[PDB]
Amino acid sequence: VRYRLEPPPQARRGDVGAWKSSLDNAAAQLEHQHLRILNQELLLKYGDKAWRAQVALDEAAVRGLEAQLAALRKETDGLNRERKLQQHAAGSELSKLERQY
C-alpha cells in the first residue's frame, strides 16, 4: 500500500508532517526507480555475456552431476556383479552338499 506511492488522504491532507511522510515515500520511490533504470540499463548494456557465463556454469553443474550419477551407477553395478558372482560360487556348492546329504 505504501508502494503505490500516495500522498496524505482526506484526514491526513491538512497536516504538513504527513507531507513530510509523503516527502519520504515520494523521494524514496523516485530514486528507487532511478537506480532501478540504472541497473537495468547497466545489464542490457553489459550483462549479456555474464548471463552467458552463468548459464554455462549451470550446464557445467548439470553435466558433472550426471557424470557422478553414471560413475556411481557403474561402481555400484560392478559391486553388484561381484556379489552375483559370489552368490553363484556358493549356491552351486550348497546345492551339491544338500543333494549328497
Binding site: W51, V55, A61
Partner: protein
C-alpha cells in the same frame, strides 16, 4: 526496459531455470544412487561372509 529485458535475455533465463531444475532433479537421484551404493555394499558384505 524490463520488457526488452524479458524479450532479449529472459529466454536465457528460461534456459537457466531449466538447467537448475534439471541439475536439482538429477541430484535427487544422484544421492539416491549413493544410498543404492550403501545398501549394495551392505549386502556385498552380508552375502560375502
Amino acid at each position: 526496459l524490463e520488457g526488452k529485458l524479458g524479450l532479449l535475455l529472459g529466454g536465457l533465463q528460461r534456459r537457466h531455470g531449466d538447467l537448475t531444475g534439471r541439475v536439482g532433479e538429477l541430484w535427487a537421484q544422484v544421492r539416491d544412487a549413493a544410498q543404492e551404493l550403501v545398501c549394495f555394499k551392505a549386502l556385498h558384505e552380508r552375502e560375502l561372509r
